[PDB]
Design a binder for these strands. Sequence first.
RNA 1: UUUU
Lengths: 68, 88, 75, 68, 94, 94, 75
Amino acid sequence: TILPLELIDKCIGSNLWVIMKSEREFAGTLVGFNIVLKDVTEYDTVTGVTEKHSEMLLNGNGMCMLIP
Amino acid sequence: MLPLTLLNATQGRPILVELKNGETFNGHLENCDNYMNLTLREVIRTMPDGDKFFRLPECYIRGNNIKYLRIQDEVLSQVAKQQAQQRE
Amino acid sequence: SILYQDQRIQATFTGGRQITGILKGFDQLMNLVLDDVEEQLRAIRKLGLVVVRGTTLVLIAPMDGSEEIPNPFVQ
Amino acid sequence: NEFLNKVIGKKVLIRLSSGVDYKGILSCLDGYMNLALERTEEYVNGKKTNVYGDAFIRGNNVLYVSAL
Amino acid sequence: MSLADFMEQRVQVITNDGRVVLGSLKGFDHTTNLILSDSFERIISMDQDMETIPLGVYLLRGENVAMVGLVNEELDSEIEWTKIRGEAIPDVVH
Amino acid sequence: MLFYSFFKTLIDTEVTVELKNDMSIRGILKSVDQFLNVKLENISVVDASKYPHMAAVKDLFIRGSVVRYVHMSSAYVDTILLADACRRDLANNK
Amino acid sequence: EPLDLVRLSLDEIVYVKLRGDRELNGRLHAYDEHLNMVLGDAEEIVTIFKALKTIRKHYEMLFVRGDSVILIAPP
RNA sequence: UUUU
């Protein structure tokens, strides 16, 4: 088998795509982990509005899926 | 009578589960824990508007999403009889 | 844990998201590693290899033997 | 979590899950993401709506902290 | 709990989704999970007469319980619930 | 324990509990626990014609998590002693 | 340490913003780590939906459960 | 994984 958090740990320094339970997503470079992302794009998947962030602390409570 | 005592006593029996999201699940209770997590066998899943229905051989339900469970009267009767004899 | 390895499962999340994928790993908090994931939109989109956070799961079921049925309840 | 040192004492953008934004100097942060800010401006639908001289924000509402 | 004061008596539960269910309190625990037996739901509305749905044995998860009222048998005997109209109880908003 | 203790000092006095479903219930506080679950006696729903559902309920259990406010007469609250108790609770938690 | 901000407001008037488009102005007499609070001489403003109206109420003494609190500030 |  495979361990989710070991896979995520493998993703440090690589690009990660995060899908919230709500209709919001973030895509950025995983810095560490609640997660810290660098050079992030935030997507509102209903309104379509996109916003950029240099670096951010993302609260973990609302994340649904993490995708390498 | 404790609620989890009743829930454990309905293992092996039919059960109706309604979730916060409004779906209902009809099936046989295969197992449960003190979180109220459930595993059901031979299940009918009903979507919130009663529009659509699925058959599932088995399924796992996180207890934190349960609103309520419906349990046969005989289960409650069985538990009360056993506890009132355990008193003696 | 009262609960598929390499079998295709369906999962439902609080908030409504619904996905299928092949269970390739898990841990005791019920985080999942699913491969070949497809999200059913509210039609599909393909997510590939995903880590799902167990705290957001509401439902896990196997896909094999799961089917839509007409109303089975006596009116 | 070298994010903290990089961010404590500088201007930050706080987005709540509700979508309301707060911009201000971050005094302090904790594990539940409770925040203390130093001169907060509140933005709703992107518009400045209120100015607070100091603010404690309860962390359960915080979606993210992003550096500016 | 104070709910021990209501044991083995008719009780009326208001849930977070606004539903009203009456039944005999057979047990509870420290999270407010409840067992009701001989229970039924009451749907009071403004547009139509009250509906009563039989529910049997009902295990309610405490997270979904807002209030548990002790139904006063005399007061309830004085009321004709058939001709009673009222607003839907709102959902709990956290 | 600070607010559990505070509510204990209000037992036997009249309070109004506003819930997160926008219902408000007035009654005599009879009991409170560590969760701030509360038991009220001789309740009357504030807007009773809006909510006739509790016309047969005199004693009421309210789950602490569904409370928005409790408001009470200032006559039964010593705010100098309350603030001192708060400072001693904060210090104990240091 | 964030809570130290609220420590400085003990016995001072605070503004509190709550979930559900509610706001409080009152004198902070006690709080705990959940942000449960007791305010004295409090005014509540409820905004009803651009707003349709606001409703102001006064409370001599008011316990507020902490899980409704969004933010706490000087008035 | 039920009341912060």
